[PDB]
Amino acid sequence: KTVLDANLDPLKGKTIGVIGYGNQGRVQATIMRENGLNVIVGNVKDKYYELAKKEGFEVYEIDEAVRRSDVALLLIPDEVMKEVYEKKIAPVLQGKKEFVLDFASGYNVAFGLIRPPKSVDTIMVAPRMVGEGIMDLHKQGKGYPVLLGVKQDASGKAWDYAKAIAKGIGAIPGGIAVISSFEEEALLDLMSEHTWVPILFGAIKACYDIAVKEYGVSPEAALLEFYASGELAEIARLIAEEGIFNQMVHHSTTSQYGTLTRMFKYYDVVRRIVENEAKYIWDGSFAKEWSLEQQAGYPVFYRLWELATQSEMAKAEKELYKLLGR
């Protein structure tokens, strides 16, 4: 099912704590205030505390913000969220008889890394839009798409709170709110980061490496074909506006034929990759792998960053981007 509008009433006369004043936090706080909700901000004292104060919000330490709140949006990065939840939020939530904890990312709840108490409505309103894009579309009077989820319905009104927040943050009406789940949103997010993105970058690197090492192509010619021209961004725009296949009518018949035949040829290969990565997300295996990479001090993350940025392709890219003035 889909949701095109909602009643804002379950959030009326409630103190709403936006924890974290980053990309998502600033935008979700600002727009909820513009729709006349009582919004405070929780944040450590960074630049982000200052900016929230400067944009007229009551700003507190995270534990205080949660103490004062009936509803909190935990909009901090996933990789620090567990520490902050356990030290500054969970102790306060032992006190509350009723509470609504919202997330924009399913990861930590989906894999059981954060388990709010039985009394807490655990809900998700997860945009598919960067944050600069959300401000832009709100200024134009338009909405954006979100995924909704409820892990734990303590109150019996968790879905109403989720729909309410979706209206509050300016997603609906004008955009859509899709009925989803914490597990589903985490799966979808990670499937992209672990399949089509890395397959795309690998394929582009292999194009460069084969063109240059085996066919005697200049680094600059190879870079200009494989990504360094505008090409990739104007195809990506037509995919979003017209459709992934519909968009192909603007290319030569030679191009259409080559892409269609090779897409069907290699579907089974990329399908096996997608199946294996999806299974490994859904099991919890990826959450264990990444948690243990963090606890080990990021040595694989560190070395793969070095090897990617010191690749023949990355070095040639640096020289070409210098030569073109970027």
Scan residues 151-190 and list those touching Mg ion (CB under 5 A): 189
Let me know if 99 is exposed, middle or buried by CB neighbors in 10 A (0-12, 13-18, 19+).
buried
Q: Is 184 in the site for a second copy (CB under 8 A)?
A: yes
Give yes or no for residue 153 binding a second copy (CB under 8 A).
no
Closest CA to 70 of 52, 36, 93: 93
Nearest to 39 by CA among 73, 5, 63: 73
In the list Mg ion, a second copy, none, the entry touching 308 (Cβ below 5 to 8 angstroms by class) is: a second copy
Other C-beta atoms closer than 10 Å to the C-beta of 228 total 20
Report whether 105 contacts 186 (CB < 8 A): yes
Instruction: Give the nearest distance from C-beta 274 to a second copy in angstroms.
Output: 4
Write down how long the chain is.
326
**Binding pattern to a second copy, positions 261-300, x when CB under 8 A?**
xxxxxxx-xxx-xxx-xx---xxxxxxx-xxxx-xxxxxx
Distance CA 326, CA 312 (A): 19
Would you count residue 254 as binding Mg ion (CB under 5 A)? yes
Tell the smallest beta-carbon distance from residue 58 to Mg ion (Å). 29
Q: Does 133 bind a second copy (CB under 8 A)?
A: yes
Nearer to a second copy among residue 33 and residue 178 (C-beta):
178
- Please tell me whether residue 323 binds a second copy under the rule CB under 8 A: yes
Residue 193 beta carbon to Mg ion: minimum distance, rounded to whole angstroms? 6
Contact criterion met (CB below 8 Å) for 155 and 122: no
Q: For the CB of residue 121, give the shortest distance to a second copy in the complex, in Å.
A: 20
Contact residues: Mg ion, CB under 5 A = 189, 192, 252, 254-255
